[PDB]
């Protein structure tokens, strides 16, 4: 300190430094501990989709291959003729398919 400088704390004893920087707060993550570099799982990265997949691409890819109508349908098999309601339903479906 010259003729114009107020003194200030320049050195700390190790005990005082430990009291200041060893509490649960103010303790650095890497001081006395093995810091393992966190990384996302490799399978998560593998299954992760590239790019952002904007809404146009999402809507387009939701209907991508053969249309879902191949599975979203019914097949009318007249298993038994006792069910008159089922027979009528099958007959109406046959009309719809034929005409």
């Amino acid at each position: 300190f010259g003729e114009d400088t107020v003194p200030y704390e320049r050195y700390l004893t190790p005990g005082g430094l430990q009291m200041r920087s060893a509490r649960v707060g103010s303790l650095r993550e890497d001081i006395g501990q093995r810091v393992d570099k966190e990384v996302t799982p490799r399978f998560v990265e593998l299954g992760q989709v590239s790019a952002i997949r904007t809404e146009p691409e999402i809507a387009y890819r939701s209907n991508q291959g053969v249309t879902r109508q191949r599975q979203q349908t019914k097949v009318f098999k007249l298993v038994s003729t006792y069910d008159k309601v089922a027979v009528k339903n099958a007959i109406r479906a046959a009309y719809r398919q034929v005409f």
Binding site: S50, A51, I52, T54, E55, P56, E57, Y60
Partner: protein, 161 residues
């Protein structure tokens, strides 16, 4: 062509009514996004040549297209690819600035499919190049502003599909 403002105006004019609160709200939303759009457009204009450079480097270089007999062989054809990718980037920037992907339909996708089919241009390879452009531009202008650029480049890719 069309943009967000022209889209709102045409939406009002088809039924002939004036602009109600919803139209003004949509215009306000576009004006809010305008700063981001201008930022991204200026950045992409400044770095247009670079973006196509790394897209070609990480999507097409050292491949069958570039090898002799490849469609990207014959340096005139390579320059044609560079010009076409620049066209895609510029018109995608147009769509991003406008907020509506109609300029792409009426000025880029108009006859482009037939052009490439008649010319033997690999459509999937071009789509991959455009995707690489999307990744590069997203990394260059951030995730949010890059989202719009990705949307419009994806529109171009889907139209070219």
């Amino acid at each position: 062509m069309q943009d967000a403002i022209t889209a709102v105006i045409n939406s009002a004019d088809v039924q002939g009514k004036y602009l109600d609160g919803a139209a003004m709200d949509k215009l306000k939303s576009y004006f809010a996004s305008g700063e981001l759009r201008v930022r991204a457009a200026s950045v992409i204009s400044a770095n247009a040549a670079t973006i196509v450079k790394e897209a070609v480097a990480k999507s097409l270089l050292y491949s069958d297209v570039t090898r002799p007999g490849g469609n990207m062989y014959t340096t005139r054809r390579y320059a044609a690819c560079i010009r076409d990718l620049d066209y895609y980037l510029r018109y995608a920037t147009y769509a991003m600035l406008a907020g509506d992907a109609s300029i792409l339909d009426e000025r880029v996708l108009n006859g482009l499919k037939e052009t490439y089919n008649s010319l033997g241009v690999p459509i999937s390879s071009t789509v991959q190049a455009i995707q690489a452009i999307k990744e590069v531009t997203a990394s260059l202008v951030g995730a949010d502003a890059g989202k719009e650029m990705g949307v419009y480049l994806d529109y171009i890719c889907s139209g070219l599909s």
